[PDB]
Design a protein around this ligand. Structure first.
Ligand SMILES: NC(=O)c1ccc[n+]([C@@H]2O[C@H](COP(=O)([O-])OP(=O)(O)OC[C@H]3O[C@@H](n4cnc5c(N)ncnc54)[C@H](OP(=O)(O)O)[C@@H]3O)[C@@H](O)[C@H]2O)c1
Ligand SMILES: NC(=O)c1ccc[n+]([C@@H]2O[C@H](COP(=O)([O-])OP(=O)(O)OC[C@H]3O[C@@H](n4cnc5c(N)ncnc54)[C@H](OP(=O)(O)O)[C@@H]3O)[C@@H](O)[C@H]2O)c1
Lengths: 334, 334
């Protein structure tokens, strides 16, 4: 019956979203950059056994190249994103591409004429950087009215500044475009995403949410930075994120942007849980002892108030299947 | 003018609910056991300044004494309840009287013929005691389908077992009665209640939530016992509880029982916050350095799902005015 597009079928979240859509009885069109690279897209053949799944070549840097994948779709899920933070001149090799790639895909949706709603996958990176509140000494519950401070980040350019900036600006641009062209756009703002997916070359948050077990120094540093800034980390199961995305597509009254987040542990509480459940990795929870900081946390109320239900509600349920995914991926050594 | 009854106007929560009802424009009737006790009831005279407030003499052990107080009321808020003590026969001295006193007030509610809805104040004490969930070493989120285990509590009679049993059995019986007589009954289930109220002789949870500042040994043990069991405590501001009670009376869709809770700190997080904001009391957060424990927490979703909004959402807003209240009561030395 209904048809939907997912950009970046080879991606972590995009692969998970394709599965849900097929299981839910959708015809699905997805885009990858190199449909012939079976090292990254071998899962697509398996996913085709669940329902009608069509693969298209596309690149956010090639204008109009999403025209065919998005043609005929009732819903489009803008999941793919550059995400190459790297360095150099981020304003031009990260921020401007991200903004333009988003507008590229948006134009293909207007040219299709069929798209009843675009669902954009942004990030709480576009929510949390509030230099008027961080450093306050007080706790804060941030909601969807909160936007990361682009001006402050451009001025001081702290590490990873271009990530929050890309997300804020691509979302503002996509929203204006949508209003300009009369197309319905809804945005979901995930926290750290945890869980298994079909993608065979996923890295992304799997590396970070598993870093206590692998000892990956970049994942560990990313977790500690979030905790020192917000007094906690925030986690959501990929399958809840996917269901929330589909929920926003299918509920007519859905409107605006939505935090998607479920469990907010401190690092010592997360490490204690992993050490007890997976002792083979030798986690030492005291490695993560930290002061009790004021909590700058994410409000969970918007999706809930509108009738959505998370199914992975405890730490145990959020980590129900990610460890085996990391092992299969090679992210974990055993 | 809509009219509502609040049982136990001398009490902590009862007084704050009276105050809310008046500000919202209700005609309020309330009960106490000695209307002439102006030391204990001075606030009832002060509250007549903000709206119509009539005081009656009633006792839950005295059949029919609530007839006049609930007569002509659209809503009846059953806040009053006998306080817990340690009895040689908690079945005859506590459990059975708690049931009967609840049914006593229920009868007056039908006999009045006007009562559109009864709001019962129970407690998460009727939710949390789940021997499997508490003992299995895993985290859990309890919701409104969870009931404290009466059979287990009777079989093994841990200290204070009769409190949870009294709340479960009286809620069950009140629900049976309401069905059998055609009166709408909604039940609210609060956690530890924090904040200033009009009552001049209030103790209850004010004692417990200030016990870190006061040194009160029974309060500190109460907090520590909850942390030992659940890995945390659960707090809600008395004004949100009062607004939630009113919300459940005025929304015809409301149905069943509702947890009322908002902020769930560990003891060391609560002590750290109090030490930093109230140094004059010499709180030592390290006194609460617990190994931590699996977290058996409360679901907040039911009231949110049905449209209710909490106003005290950070730990600091939950403690926005209770320290001054404990001083005015003499619970806090200075
Ligand atoms: N995972 C989390 O914890 C998290 C949290 C918050 C927000 N998000 C956001 O959710 C989205 C999905 O992220 P993810 O975790 O699934 O990471 P991912 O596995 O790296 O997915 C990124 C996708 O974008 C594709 N892509 C990048 N540049 C492209 C381009 N120029 N043209 C076409 N495709 C391009 C990638 O394909 P190639 O590999 O072929 O380049 C890939 O499929 C992202 O927008 C992320 O920023 C994720
Ligand atoms: N405060 C919390 O953290 C919390 C948490 C969960 C549930 N609750 C429940 O919420 C309700 C209000 O509690 P509270 O904090 O406001 O404690 P409270 O200040 O002690 O109020 C309890 C009231 O019950 C009245 N009462 C006791 N026996 C009575 C009787 N035989 N007849 C008539 N009245 C009687 C008492 O009036 P007298 O002075 O005349 O005895 C008293 O005012 C309670 O049902 C409690 O179980 C409170």
């Amino acid at each position: 019956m209904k048809t939907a597009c997912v950009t970046g079928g080879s991606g972590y979240i995009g692969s998970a979203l394709i599965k849900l859509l097929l299981e839910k009885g959708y015809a699905v069109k997805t885009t990858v950059r190199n449909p012939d690279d079976m090292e990254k897209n071998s899962h697509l053949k398996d996913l085709q056994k669940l329902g009608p799944l069509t693969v298209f070549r596309a690149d956010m840097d090639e204008e109009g190249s999403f025209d065919d994948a998005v043609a005929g779709c009732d819903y489009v899920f803008l999941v793919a994103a550059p995400l190459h933070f790297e360095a150099q001149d981020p304003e031009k090799e990260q921020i401007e591409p991200a903004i333009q790639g988003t507008l590229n895909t948006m134009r293909s949706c207007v040219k299709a004429g069929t798209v009843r709603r675009v669902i954009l996958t942004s990030s709480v990176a576009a929510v949390y950087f509030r230099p008027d509140l961080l450093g306050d000494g007080h706790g804060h519950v941030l909601d969807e009215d909160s936007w990361s401070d682009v001006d402050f980040l451009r001025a001081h350019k702290p590490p990873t500044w271009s990530h929050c900036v890309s997300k804020v600006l691509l979302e503002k641009e996509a929203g204006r475009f949508a209003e300009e062209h009369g197309i319905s756009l809804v945005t979901i703002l995930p926290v750290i995403v945890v869980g298994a997916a079909p993608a065979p070359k996923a890295r992304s948050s799997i590396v970070d949410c598993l870093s206590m077990l692998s000892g990956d120094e970049a994942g560990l540093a990313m977790l500690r930075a979030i905790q020192k800034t917000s007094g906690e980390v925030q986690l959501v199961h990929v399958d809840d994120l996917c269901r929330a995305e589909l929920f926003l597509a299918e509920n007519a009254t859905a409107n605006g942007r939505y935090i998607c987040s479920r469990y907010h542990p401190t690092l010592v509480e997360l490490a204690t849980f992993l050490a007890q459940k997976y002792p083979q990795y030798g986690v030492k929870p005291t490695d993560f002892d930290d002061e009790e900081r004021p909590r700058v946390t994410m409000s969970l109320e918007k999706l809930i108030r509108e009738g959505f239900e998370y199914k992975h509600n405890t730490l145990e349920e959020i980590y129900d299947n990610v460890v085996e995914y990391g092992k299969a991926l090679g992210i974990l050594p055993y």
